[PDB]
Structures are given as C-alpha cells and as structure tokens.
C-alpha cells in the first residue's frame, strides 16, 4: 500500500517501454542509472513499480560481484542477461534486470574512489552488452540464434568516471532522484496509513525534519515498544530477565497496541537526531 | 608362551588401542597440514573383496580447520549408527589416496 | 587533488597464453581459422585450443581431484593471413 | 559494591531482551554500539551489567582482526558466533558476543593509511551476520542448518572512522556515553565507599575537577599507596628487593590504610593534572 | 660509580614492586612511560637501575615495529611478553620488558606521511596487554592457562604523536624527566669523580653551560683524549696503524690522565657549542 512518486514511475515506464518498442529511426539507451543519497528508497520504489506493472524482475546483489571470493563478474552478468531473455518467451511478459550498489557494499572504503580489477570487468562486460544487445556470448556452446534485447537498471550513490564514454555516447541515461515536500507526504503518509494519522499531522512530521532521509521516518516506527520493554524489565527484575525469556516454557510476552500520537513521534525523532549528530 | 587370539582387523591403525577423539583430531590435522583433501566414506559390510565405499556428501575441498571434518563425521554417525565409517585423504598431484583409517564401527 | 606514494604489507595466500614457450617434447599444430562475424581473434583461438584438448569450462568436484595445468593444450602464437579478412 | 548507572543498565537490558523476544512487524537491530571518550567507563560497566544479570560473554580482542593469512580473521568471527550460538541451546540462558576496540581493527584512521584485503572481509562479514543472524554458515560447508540468534555488543572510541553501511538504523543501534553530575557522584561515591566520606565532601571533589574522566579518580585512589611502598623498599634495601618480593618464604608486608581526607586528595589530584599539563605542553 | 638521581630511582622502584605485590582493592597501571628532552639520561639511568637491583631486561627496538607481513609487529610484542613471563617462573626473580624509543615505532607526525595497518595494530595490542596482563594469547593456539604479570617500561621523546586511549592515567603511568641544578651537579660530579675537582669548580661548569643536556658533559671528556691519541697515530705512522689495534699480539697502548682543570674544560666546552650552533644556523 506504499505510495510511489509519479516522477519515479514515469522514468521507469519510458525506459522499459521504448526498449521493447520497435520504432525505426529511433535510438534508445539500454542502461539507466539512478544516483541519490542513501535511504532515499530507490531500490524500494523499483520493486514496487514492477509489481504494479506485473513485470518480472531479476536482482543481482552489488556484493555478489564485488567480493574476491565470489566467482567471475564477467561470466556472471552475461549468464543473468541470457536467463532474463529466456523469460520473455516463456513468460510472455516484459523482463528487466537491475543491479544495486555496483560500486558499493563491497566492504571497501573507497566506494569508487579507487578502481579495482573487479571494477574494470563490470565496465567491460556492460559496454559489450550495450553495443551488441541482440547477441551475447558465453565461453562455450555459442548459439547463432539471436536473443531478445533486455533493459538494464542500475542504482548507486554516484557513477565512476569509467562510465563517462557510455553517457556521452548516450547509451546510458542518468537519473538523479531527490525527494520533495509532496513526495515526503506521500511516502510518510503510506507508512503511517495503517496507524491512522490526519493530513495536518503528517505535514508536521516532515516540517519537524525538513532535511532528512526517507529511511529515518520509517525507522521511527520501530522504537514504539521501548517504553513497554523497559517497564516490563522492572516487574520481572534485572536478576532474572534472561532465564524466563531465553529458555523457559511460559506464556510469551504480550504487548498492547502502542498508542499513536504526534507527540511520541517528535520525542523519538529528537533522540535519533541527537545520536546521528554525535556519531558524525 | 602365549597363543594369539583370533581377531578381525581393519587395515591401518587397527592394531593400536581404540583411538580417542584427541588422537583422531591429530590424524586429521596431519591430512590438512600436508595439503590433502579430506573425505568421509561409509559402508554396511567390512570385506576385503569390496574396495568401494559409499561417499558421504562430497569431498571437503574448502576445509580450514580439523573441527569441520569431525563435525561431518558426527553427522554421518548419528544418521547411520550401524555402518562402518572411515576418513580418506585425496592427493591431486600424485593422484592417489595417502591416508585411510576407520573412525566408527557398528554399535552392538 | 592530492597524490601520494606508498609502501605496503601483504596478507598472501586459462587457455590462451602468449608467454608460453614450446618444449622439445611437444606436439604442435597449425590451424587456418575463420570465425563468425562479431567474434574476437584471441577468443576464437582460445576456443580452438580448449575444444581440441580437454574442454572443461566449468569446474566439477571430479576436476579438483587432478592437476589442471598438467594436461592442457594452449595457444601460443597468432599470425594473420595476408590479403584476407577475418 | 560498584555502582552502575541506571541509564547504562537500561540501555543494555532492553537491547539484549528485545533480540530474544519476538514481536511481529518490528525490525530489530542486532548490534549495539557504545562510543564516547577514553576511560569514561564503557568496557568496565559492561562487565558489571553482565554480572548482575548473570549472562555468558564471548570476547574478541581488538587487534586480532588482521593476520598474515587472507580470510583468516573473517573466519574467526563466524566461528566465535556459532560457538556462542550453541551455548544457548546447551546451558539454557542468554549469551552475548562482545568485540572490544573495533575502532582500531576495522576503522580507517585516515586517507593516507593503506589497508589489506582482511579489513575488507571483516566489514563484509559483519554486514552479513547483521542481515541474516539466523542463517550463519562457514565458507565451504554442506550443513546449512538454522542456528540461534546472538546479539552483539561493540565498543570503540570514534565511529566517525568506521565503515559507513555498518552504522545504519536497521543494522546497528548506536549509543553515546557521557556521565553527568549525578552519574559522576554515584560512581566516584562507589569507589570511595570503603574510605568513608560525607555527601558534601564527595560533591566538592567532582566540583574541583569537573572536566575529568572516571579513571582519573581511580588513579589518585591507587596513588595514595606510594609512600608506604617506598618506605618498604628502603628498609629492606635495593640490593635485595627482588628476592624479598618474588621468591620469599616469609609473610607479605601489610600496609595500614592511609588517611583519606578531602584536602589530601585535592593535593594529589592537582599533582596528576600537573603531569598531564606537562605532556600537553 | 655513577650517580643515579633519587627521584628517578624511587619512581622506578615503586612502580615495579607495586606490580608484583597484590595489595587488595588497588587497581595498578601496568606501563610506565618516561618522556623528556633528548640526552637527559632516560635510557642510561634505567640500565644503571636494573643492574643495581639485579633484575632481568627484555629489549624491543623502536624500529623493529614494522615488517612486510600484516599483523607481524603485533605478534612480536605478545611473543616477547610471554617469554619474559616464563623467566619469573623459572629463575624466581623480578623481570621487566622494556620498549625503548616507542615514539618512532607507532606515532604519526604530520598529515602527509602515509602509514600502514601495523601502526594501528601495535597500538591495539599494547592496550589489550595493559587491560588483561594474565591473558595474553598467540594466533592459532588457544589454551586456557594463566601466566604471570610482567611490568613494561617505555621511553619516548614526545608522546603527543601516539594513540590517545593508550595514554591514560589508568592504562599507563606518566613520568616527565627534566633534571634540576642539584640533579645536574650530582650527575656531572659523578662523571668527574675520579678526576678530582672541588665542589666550587663543579658548580662553575654547570653555570657556564646551563642550557645543556647530560650527554654534553660526557662528550667533553672524549675531546680531552684527542691529543694523546693523535700523537700515538703519528708515532706508529698512518701506513700501519690498522695492524696495531685490530689483530695485534702486543700489550695495548697506555695513556696518562690529562690535566683536568677548569680553564681547559671551559675551552673544550665552548668549541662543542660552536659545532652545535653551526648545524642550527645552516641555510641549505
Ligand atoms: N563504574 C565504575 N566503577 C568503578 N571504577 C570504574 C567505573 N567505571 C570506570 N572505572 C575505572 O576507570 C577505568 C575505565 O575503564 P573502561 O571502561 O575500559 O574505559 P573506556 O571507556 O572503555 O576507555 P577506552 O575508550 O576503551 S580506552 C576502569 O579500568 C576503572 O578503573
Ligand atoms: N647519570 C649519568 N651518569 C653518567 N653519564 C650519563 C648519565 N646520564 C647520562 N649520561 C650520558 O649521556 C648519555 C645520555 O643517554 P640517554 O639515557 O639515551 O639519554 P636519553 O634522554 O634516553 O636520549 P633520547 O631521548 O632517547 S635520544 C648516556 O649514554 C651517557 O653517556
Ligand atoms: N516509498 C516508500 N514507502 C515506504 N518505505 C520506503 C519507501 N521508499 C523507501 N522506503 C524505505 O527505505 C528503506 C530502503 O531504502 P532503499 O530502497 O535501499 O534506498 P536507497 O537505495 O536509496 O539506499 C526501507 O526501510 C523502506 O521501507
Ligand atoms: Mg575500553
Ligand atoms: Mg635513548
């Protein structure tokens, strides 16, 4: 029931549609890349959009091709591209392959500041697919028969300089997604829709923290049981909190549905602000 | 003078008194130190005629510690209490088994 | 921009090879190769050396019980044919 | 006899209980991070809180997270996690894994500093356990059996120098430690509880040195013993002080409890400040 | 025959003996750090002190704390600590591990200077041993066995360029050494004790050159022996001076004691001061 921003949906629609469409005289970028701040919800929006459209999605982890002890990215991206192409025929629906954190989540500090051998391989593989999308080749069992072209989505914080050729060529399209007031109200409104908050209340939350990530507001819901747990500990007592809960056959702890008010959310908001401030 | 009692034997290290869990740990440590691949085999009957034993899962190509091997022996032992179980060590360069010894016998 | 030079500490731990020098006890073969359009020269040569020897692109549990470099044919030289395309 | 701050106690108790409790819908972070200033009572207070509740602790050293073997420290963490996971199923009580001084193990000091592949792996491992705590397996195994969830306690000096994805709302609950006036009075009061000081006197001691770490009071406490030992060394003699203290078949030298007066302690406190000031200059 | 300052002797005697004694309800710091200006007698007076009390020393160089293997300088400190712990058990005497010149081992100077992981891990390891003296382990060998506590002595020029949490009152006792007039007179007097100078003469020597380290006065004696040595080289000859000091089966050359006077000592001291000034007032 989560809200999707109209702009985000439009950018996905046009890219997927145009690639699948067969209009002569027209050139289309195969790869689309989205860069934004962390916890903006780029991954979350992509997954939602595909469900509404009903189009099949193949997901490849950023850490799956960044790790030295994983395999071969060059052999992997090719294999995933072929498999996605098979879905269109069998499934009879549009199929898209997307990558998350191409230059991130590896564990390395640089985050694309310094290139790696593995970084070079992805660039090489992607460039080959973008030039010749219709024909993609594995090491063995070369097939003469062409494959249906498949659109690619990529999300990150920023794009490396190695990709600059593709963008100048116009083979890659870069979309910068930043939330607005209207977008915030939608997303915040969707999260707390089940709780039941007035329109005026939702506006106040966004106004309290004008410059905040989308992830923060979602994280606020989690710290509602804290008061109950803290109070519960006292009745049981510190001496034997562990034993009863960890490995004892008794009735499981029961918590009444937390009351939802704006005051509680502001108090919780301040605490997370303070902690983030001190850490950075 | 003493007459030797009739007793059935089980290849290597069967004449020594029954191996303790510490002793088996030291023998497996030898296999990993040399750089051989450890593997677990099990069989219903112990016969000199038969030379193939059914392999337990697959050879352990990525084993860092001897504890990982012993944990695989305990899994087979709990599953098959009445089967013979042995530990083998494959060498890739020589293309031959280097060490093979029995770790479990059928209980009662 | 700020560039630096460094010293470092180290933790520590497949068919086309032009660096290899042929032995006196080797069987050598010359092929006149014609690939399909959209196939590289070095890729086509690596495919011939693999398929005429052992093949084996994917490693199985049986393959790890033996040496891989010992029994393997390799391409060491590529020469173009004059006045001909691909 | 030692005082634990209620703030510090309630923060630990909730995080550890919440991990063992199952509440539908709520996403609970696995790791709790305690960070602040040096010698403010981060490691010491954790020990006290694990004694009162009576829970089992698995410790990992800070500088243990780098080896002359690739992969080796990353394998270390998974192994210690699974050992703690088994303990819950056997003993039948709470168990916790604490990595102390994680700032000097994984933390990037500065841009200049060059790192190996091991530091990459340790960040990569901790992200996995924080995502799939129930599904932890060793690299290259044929087990894949669901194991028990184990909460992690992490202590450091500066989290500003620590891999960015690790410090996330869903992944790690951070916590900043800084004792207040009341907190200081309680703790310092706990140190000098056997000495016998009035409430007013204890207030004055904190007021005299307000911008001080907790260890600073313990330093002067231990220091009110120097004169006695110095007198003992002279009487015995410098030539035979080793045999009289190491391989002696006699009775250990007793030391009468020194005078613990506010005026004498302020004098001693000024002396320690003077030592720090000399370094600072 | 050398004079050790009573301030320096007391500080060392107390810290070491305190660690071996187990006074109940007292938390003791494991590491003693001594810092001061160069050539003031930090290292030298330690070696005099350990010899007097007759206690065993294990030495770690400062420049030893870097190797091309990751976490290998960190492994060395643990190994050297355990070896010292065995000495107490077997020999039955006090033992001390001493790391001299730690400033150049695990300290960062500017911002430009690129370092390595080892610096980070050396500081990590020293904090651990200070935390848990009884529990020191080696990688690959985990055995539950307690070992005896060993005190550590650290010498440095500047501690400012060192990881902060490692220098705190609980973890390390700090000591600043800067000798006074009475300390100077005592030490310098101890050097020239055999020579035979009056009290007033020794006062004057310190007064003439007040802003000077201890090493200055020990360096002064070397220059008085120049004349005798130069004359010896000439008499033998430059051609065969080598085969008369290294591998010679003859009685070593003997030198008489030079005229140790105030006037002569002053002149020599002025010449050394000029030599120091020359390096300081250098353009490029
Ligand atoms: N609550 C307390 N009761 C008695 N003594 C305390 C208490 N808290 C701290 N101390 C003393 O001060 C020292 C502080 O120890 P830690 O808890 O290791 O400090 P820290 O915050 O972990 O310092 P860093 O950042 O790891 S160096 C202890 O060794 C005790 O001597
Ligand atoms: N007490 C003394 N009695 C006789 N000679 C001394 C005495 N103290 C110092 N000296 C001399 O001066 C030198 C000073 O040596 P150190 O003890 O290394 O000084 P230092 O302060 O440790 O040097 P740094 O700071 O490590 S470069 C000694 O080697 C002796 O030659
Ligand atoms: N439209 C949305 N509705 C609800 N939650 C959202 C929405 N967009 C993002 N989120 C939240 O964002 C988090 C995931 O962020 P992610 O999609 O990975 O962002 P990014 O890729 O920009 O880092 C989740 O907690 C998810 O609930
Ligand atoms: Mg600490
Ligand atoms: Mg020195």
Both A229 and A207 in one domain: the answer is yes
Distance, C-alpha B94 to centroid of its chain: 20
Dist CA A162 CA A112 (whole Å): 10
Torsion angle of C-alpha atoms A181, A186, A191, A196, degrees rounded to 10: 100
Both D40 and D129 in one domain: the answer is yes
Dist CA D48 CA A65 (whole Å): 44
Atom of ligand 3 nearest to the CA of A5: 1
Which of A56, A55, A49, A51 lies closest to A4, judged by CA? Answer: A49
Identify whether the C-beta of residue A245 lies closer than 8 Å to the C-beta of residue D21.
yes
- From A161, A179, A197, the end of a domain falls on A179
Distance, C-alpha E227 to centroid of its chain: 31
Dist CA D122 CA D65 (whole Å): 7
| Residue D142, both tokens | 């044929």
DSSP A136-198: ---SSS---S------EEEEES---GGGHHHHHHTSEEEEE----HHHHHHHHHHHTTTT---
Both D185 and D55 in one domain: the answer is no
- CA-atom Rg of chain B in angstroms: 15
Torsion angle of C-alpha atoms A210, A211, A216, A221, degrees rounded to 10: -10
Dist CA E20 CA B106 (whole Å): 57
The order of strands in the sheet holding E172-176 is E56-60, E95-99, E152-156, E31-35, E172-176
Identify whether the C-beta of residue E72 lies closer than 8 Å to the C-beta of residue E118.
yes
In the DSSP assignment, the letter for residue E225 is T
Both E1 and E124 in one domain: the answer is yes
Dist CA B57 CA E82 (whole Å): 44
| Residue A191, both tokens | 């999260």
Dist CA E6 CA A156 (whole Å): 66
Q: Which among D116, D230, D275 has CB closest to E176?
A: D275
| Residue D171, both tokens | 């992944």
Residues 6+ positions from D271 with CB-CB distance below 8 Å: none
Best mutation site among D196, D246, D280 for testing chain E: the one with the most E CBs within 10 Å?
Answer: D246
Which of A98, A106, A109 lies closest to A155, judged by CA? Answer: A98
Which of E162, E164, E137, E167 lies closest to E65, judged by CA? Answer: E162
Burial A173-211 (b: 16+ CB within 10 A, else e): bbbebebeeebbbbbbbebbeeeebeeebbbebbeebee
Instruction: Give the number of other Cβ atoms within 10 Å of residue B25's Cβ.
Output: 14
Identify whether the C-beta of residue D175 lies closer than 8 Å to the C-beta of residue D154.
no
For residue D70, the enclosing domain spans 1-179
Both D116 and D202 in one domain: the answer is no
Which of D125, D111, D114 lies closest to D65, judged by CA? Answer: D125
| Residue B26, both tokens | 């030291």
Instruction: Give the number of other Cβ atoms within 10 Å of residue D265's Cβ.
Output: 23
Q: Which residues pair with E252 in a beta bridge?
A: none
What phi and psi values does residue E176 have, to the nearest 5 degrees?
A: -105, 130
Identify whether the C-beta of residue B100 lies closer than 8 Å to the C-beta of residue B11.
yes
Identify whether the C-beta of residue B76 lies closer than 8 Å to the C-beta of residue B54.
no
Q: Which residues line ion ligand 4, judged by CB < 5 Å?
A: D 43
Which of E171, E176, E161, E136 lies closest to E37, judged by CA? Answer: E176
- Chain C residues with beta carbon closer than 8 angstroms to that of D112: 4
Both D129 and D192 in one domain: the answer is no
- From A127, A147, A179, the end of a domain falls on A179
Distance, C-alpha A74 to centroid of its chain: 23
Identify whether the C-beta of residue D232 lies closer than 8 Å to the C-beta of residue D253.
yes
Ligand 2, from E6, E8, E35, E41: best to mutate by most atoms within 8 Å of Cβ? E41
In the DSSP assignment, the letter for residue D173 is E
Q: Which residues pair with A175 in a beta bridge?
A: A34
Tell me the residue ranges of DSSP E strands in C1-86. none
Both A64 and A196 in one domain: the answer is no
Helix (H, G, I), strand (E, B) or coil at E141: strand
Q: Please, how many CA atoms are within 13 Å of residue A60, restricted to the half-sphere of its CB?
A: 24
Ligand 3 centroid–CA D148 distance in Å is 28
> Is residue E192 in contact with ligand 2, taking CB distance under 6 Å?
no
| Residue D271, both tokens | 């002396």
What phi and psi values does residue E251 have, to the nearest 5 degrees?
A: -60, 130
Largest Cα–Cα separation, chain A? 77
Both D197 and D241 in one domain: the answer is yes
Helix (H, G, I), strand (E, B) or coil at B88: strand
| Residue D86, both tokens | 């088994």
Both E22 and E99 in one domain: the answer is yes
Residue reference for tokens 């040496």:
C67
Helix axes A117-131, A73-91, angle to 10 degrees: 40
Tell me the residue ranges of DSSP E strands in chain B. 37-43, 54-55, 84-91, 96-104
Dist CA A227 CA A225 (whole Å): 6
Which of E232, E283, E228 lies closest to E256, judged by CA? Answer: E228
The order of strands in the sheet holding D56-60 is D56-60, D95-100, D152-156, D31-36, D172-177
| Residue C47, both tokens | 């495919």
Both A42 and A128 in one domain: the answer is yes
Dist CA D49 CA A1 (whole Å): 43
Distance, C-alpha E197 to centroid of its chain: 28
Residues 6+ positions from E172 with CB-CB distance below 8 Å: E29, E30, E31, E32, E33, E130, E154, E166
Enumerate the domain spans of chain B: 1-108
- How many domains does chain A divide into? 2
Both D11 and D109 in one domain: the answer is yes
Burial B92-105 (b: 16+ CB within 10 A, else e): eeeeeeebebbbbe
Dist CA A179 CA A7 (whole Å): 10
Instruction: Give the number of other Cβ atoms within 10 Å of residue B75's Cβ.
Output: 16
Helix axes B66-79, B21-34, angle to 10 degrees: 130
Residue reference for tokens 């590896």:
A106
What phi and psi values does residue E266 have, to the nearest 5 degrees?
A: -65, -50
Best mutation site among D70, D72, D74 for testing chain C: the one with the most C CBs within 10 Å?
Answer: D70
Q: Locate all alpha helices (DSSP H) within chain E, ordered by sequence.
A: 6-20, 42-53, 73-91, 117-131, 181-191, 199-208, 215-220, 226-236, 262-280
Residues 6+ positions from A235 with CB-CB distance below 8 Å: none
- Chain C residues with beta carbon closer than 8 angstroms to that of A74: none
Which of E120, E152, E131, E126 lies closest to E12, judged by CA? Answer: E152
| Residue B24, both tokens | 């088996």
Helix (H, G, I), strand (E, B) or coil at A199: helix
- From E179, E203, E232, the end of a domain falls on E179
Between strands A56-60 and D31-36, the pairing is unpaired
Instruction: Give the number of other Cβ atoms within 10 Å of residue B31's Cβ.
Output: 23
**Alpha-carbon distances of E69 from A68, D113, E23, E74, rounded to whole Å:** 20, 16, 41, 10
Dist CA D131 CA D172 (whole Å): 11
Distance, C-alpha A116 to centroid of its chain: 24
Residue reference for tokens 């290998």:
E72
| Residue D131, both tokens | 């995502």
Q: Please, how many CA atoms are within 13 Å of residue A264, restricted to the half-sphere of its CB?
A: 13
Dist CA D173 CA A272 (whole Å): 10
Both D26 and D117 in one domain: the answer is yes
Ligand 3 centroid–CA A215 distance in Å is 6
Which of D47, D141, A31 lies closest to B58, judged by CA? Answer: D141
Helix axes D215-223, D262-280, angle to 10 degrees: 120
In chain D the first and final C-alpha atoms are separated, in Å, by 39
Residue reference for tokens 């510490």:
B22
Dist CA D69 CA C12 (whole Å): 6
Dist CA D254 CA D233 (whole Å): 13
| Residue A65, both tokens | 């091709």
Show which subunits contact A, needing at least 3 CB pairs below 8 angstroms: C, D
Identify whether the C-beta of residue C22 lies closer than 8 Å to the C-beta of residue C28.
yes
* B·D CB contacts under 8 A: 17
Cβ-in-10-Å burial (0-12, 13-18, 19+) of E100 comes to middle
For residue D154, the surrounding DSSP H or E stretch is strand D152-156
- CA-atom Rg of chain A in angstroms: 24
| Residue D16, both tokens | 């550890």
Burial C9-38 (b: 16+ CB within 10 A, else e): bebeeebbeeeeeeeeeeeeeeeeeeeeee
Q: Which residues pair with E57 in a beta bridge?
A: E96
Residue reference for tokens 């966004």:
A206
Q: Which residues pair with E210 in a beta bridge?
A: none
């Amino acid at each position: 029931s989560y809200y999707i921003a109209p702009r985000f949906l439009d950018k996905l629609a046009v890219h997927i549609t145009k690639n699948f469409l067969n209009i002569p005289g027209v050139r289309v970028p195969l790869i689309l890349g989205i860069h934004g701040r962390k916890g903006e919800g780029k991954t979350f929006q992509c997954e939602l959009a595909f469900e509404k459209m009903g189009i099949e999605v193949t997901l490849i982890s950023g850490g799956e091709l960044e790790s030295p002890d994983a395999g071969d990215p060059a052999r992997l991206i090719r294999l995933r591209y072929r498999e996605t192409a098979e879905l269109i025929k069998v499934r009879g629906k549009m199929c898209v392959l997307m990558i998350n954190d191409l230059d991130a989540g590896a564990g390395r500090f640089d985050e694309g500041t310094q290139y790696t051998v593995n970084t070079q391989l992805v660039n090489a593989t992607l460039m080959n697919i973008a030039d010749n999308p219709t024909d993609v080749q594995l090491p063995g069992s070369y097939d003469s028969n062409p494959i249906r072209r498949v659109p690619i989505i990529v999300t990150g914080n920023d794009f490396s300089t190695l990709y600059a050729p593709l963008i100048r060529d116009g083979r890659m399209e870069k979309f910068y997604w930043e939330p607005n007031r209207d977008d915030k109200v939608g997303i915040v409104g969707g999260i707390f829709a089940e709780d039941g908050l007035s329109q005026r209340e939702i506006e106040q939350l966004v106004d309290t923290f004008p410059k905040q990530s989308i992830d923060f507001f979602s994280a606020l819901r989690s710290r509602i049981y804290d008061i109950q747990i803290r109070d519960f500990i006292h009745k049981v007592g510190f001496e034997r909190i562990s034993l009863r809960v960890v490995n004892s056959l008794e009735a499981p702890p029961e918590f009444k549905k937390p009351d939802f008010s704006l005051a509680h959310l502001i108090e919780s908001g301040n605490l997370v602000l303070g902690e983030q401030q001190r850490v950075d | 003078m003493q007459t030797l009692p009739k007793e059935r034997r089980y290849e290597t290290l069967s004449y020594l008194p029954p191996l303790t869990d510490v002793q088996i740990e030291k023998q497996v440590q030898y296999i990993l130190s040399q750089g051989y691949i450890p593997a677990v085999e099990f069989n219903e009957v112990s016969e000199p005629t038969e030379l193939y034993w059914t392999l337990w899962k697959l050879p352990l190509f990525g084993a860092k510690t001897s504890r990982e091997v012993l944990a695989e022996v305990q899994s087979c032992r709990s599953q098959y209490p009445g089967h013979y179980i042995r530990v083998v060590g494959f060498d890739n360069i020589k293309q031959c088994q280097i060490l093979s010894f029995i770790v479990h016998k059928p209980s009662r | 921009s700020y560039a630096q030079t460094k010293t470092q500490t180290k933790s520590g731990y497949t068919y086309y090879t032009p660096d290899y020098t042929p032995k006196d006890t080797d069987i050598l073969a010359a092929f006149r190769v014609t690939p399909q359009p959209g196939v590289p020269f070095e890729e086509a040569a690596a495919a011939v050396a693999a398929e005429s020897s052992t093949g084996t692109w994917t490693t199985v549990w049986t393959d790890l019980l033996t040496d891989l470099d010992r029994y393997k044919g390799r391409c060491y030289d590529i020469e173009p044919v004059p006045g001909e395309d691909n």
